[PDB]
Task: inverse folding
RNA sequence: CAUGGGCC
RNA sequence: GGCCC
């Protein structure tokens, strides 16, 4: 987005801190090129002479404006896509009762219990439950107050900026390119889950190539459902986006919301409103009060769906912007946020699509750095979706999510205070697809120190997951 | 025990 | 809690 003004206020949101991620016994054995994100602008690991505050807000390269012509084209690609979407899901998007918006419904889980309630609840020393009954299903004073403020759209707000304490590649670590989270006020998140919470639930339960959404899938079983699909087309593309979230032009955002959340589809007149507020946002990074126009507050309710939807419309908008008579069924794709996998028998030319995407402020590049230029012929067994490859299991000829050993070496090398054992269990199910060998090697440094799930146990579990029949039938 | 949403 | 976005 475009930073209109960087003013300095009196208040100051304290975010500075250290990482809770401590090295593990695996570190000294692997020494991965990954490490905790620089949470301090004075961190020695940072290149001598790099303002952490400078990089954090360098993602905003401006809010690309669109010509009425392209706006009409986008509006059509939006209304068109919105047709296929709302067709499958349906038009039962009635406001989710405050109760349902808390406890969650079929598909939509429940609002996190003890998480940053955002502002101004954070400047008054209060927790999430200190304003809402996460045990019951209702809210209190503050909520009901703003709840009535949004009911009349009189409501206004701000976003609290946090430094996502995670593990990242040492290169971007020294580059002070630590990722940040835009924590919005809990009240907002609750209202959004009421306005379109119904919608999201339906999308989650219908993830797939049809609606081009992977939000709600289970890489363990859906990989087999997806793999076959893309391994059916001629060309498979794995596009990448540079600051996908922060580069959503206002015109593309407002048109999308106005097209995908109309009242004719059953949405509440405030569903479109509540979302449009996400355009012009005001961040509160410590003592500074930065204002931005455009982009997406990576950390708001249904933030992934909004991105997934946009990503879907961009592909259609771009293709039509370069070709003629291009319909949805002209190609096939699936995405989870910025991540995306495109496929189409047609020998499309993404390389000549870059500018068309740029007309939206988005910059696409080939996943495979080699010969920076979208080529052709690539199969599903080459692309990487959700940090996972598409490989076949010699044991059952099934498709299974496989993560690069280096990525696994980064995960098993760090962990917070007292979580190793538990983490080993979780991550264990992820390395089961790396094969017996790689598996035993990934947890070798923990033998006798922790309980390591046998490759056997988890393998048989997966088999029953991907296809309950594939397992039982192997008894006859 | 930094967030929205998966998912396990 | 862990991973993914
Ligand atoms: Mg990709």
Result:
């Amino acid at each position: 987005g475009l930073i209109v003004d960087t003013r300095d206020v009196e208040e100051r949101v304290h975010v500075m801190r250290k990482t809770k991620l401590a090295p593990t016994v695996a570190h000294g054995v692997f020494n991965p090129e990954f490490g905790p994100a620089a949470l301090s602008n004075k961190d020695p690991r940072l290149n001598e002479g790099v303002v952490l505050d400078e990089v954090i807000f360098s993602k905003h390269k401006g809010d690309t404006k669109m010509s009425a012509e392209d706006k009409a084209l986008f509006r059509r690609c939006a209304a068109d896509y919105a047709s296929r979407l709302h067709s499958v899901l349906g038009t039962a998007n009635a406001p989710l009762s405050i109760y349902e918006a808390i406890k969650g419904v079929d598909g939509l889980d429940a609002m996190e219990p003890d998480t940053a309630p955002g502002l101004p609840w954070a400047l008054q020393g209060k927790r999430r439950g200190a304003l809402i009954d996460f045990e019951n299903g209702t809210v209190g004073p503050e909520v009901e107050a703003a709840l009535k403020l949004m009911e009349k759209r009189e409501y206004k707000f701000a976003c609290q900026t946090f430094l996502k304490d995670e593990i990242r590649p040492m290169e971007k670590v020294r580059a002070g390119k630590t990722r940040i989270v835009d924590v919005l006020p809990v009240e907002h998140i609750l209202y959004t889950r009421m306005m379109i919470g119904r919608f999201c639930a339906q999308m989650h339960s219908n993830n797939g190539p049809q609606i081009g959404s992977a939000v709600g899938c289970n890489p363990d079983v859906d990989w087999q459902r997806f793999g076959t699909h893309f391994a059916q087309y001629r060309n498979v593309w794995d596009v990448d986006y540079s600051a996908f979230d922060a580069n959503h032009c206002s015109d593309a955002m407002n048109i999308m919301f106005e097209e995908v959340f109309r009242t004719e589809f059953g949405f509440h007149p405030n569903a479109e409103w509540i979302l449009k507020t996400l355009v012009n946002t005001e961040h509160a990074y410590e003592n500074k009060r930065i204002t931005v126009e455009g982009g997406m507050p990576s950390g708001c309710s249904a933030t992934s769906i909004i991105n997934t939807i946009l990503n879907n419309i961009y592909v259609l908008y771009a293709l039509r912007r370069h070709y003629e008579g291009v319909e949805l069924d002209t190609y096939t794709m699936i995405s989870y946020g910025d991540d995306i996998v495109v496929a189409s028998d047609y020998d499309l030319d993404f390389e000549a699509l870059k500018p068309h995407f740029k007309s939206l402020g988005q910059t696409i590049t080939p996943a495979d750095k080699s010969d920076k230029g979208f080529v052709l012929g690539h199969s599903i067994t080459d692309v990487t979706f959700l940090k996972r490859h598409f490989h076949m299991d010699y044991g059952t000829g099934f498709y299974k999510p496989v993560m690069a050993s280096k990525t696994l070496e980064a995960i098993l090398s760090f962990a917070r205070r007292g979580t190793i054992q538990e983490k080993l269990i979780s991550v264990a199910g992820l390395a089961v697809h790396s094969g017996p060998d790689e598996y035993r090697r990934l947890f070798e440094p923990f033998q006798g120190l922790f309980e390591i799930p046998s490759y056997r146990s988890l393998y048989l579990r997966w088999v029953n997951a991907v296809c309950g029949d594939a397992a039982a039938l192997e008894h006859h």
In short: The longest strand of chain A covers residues 2-8.
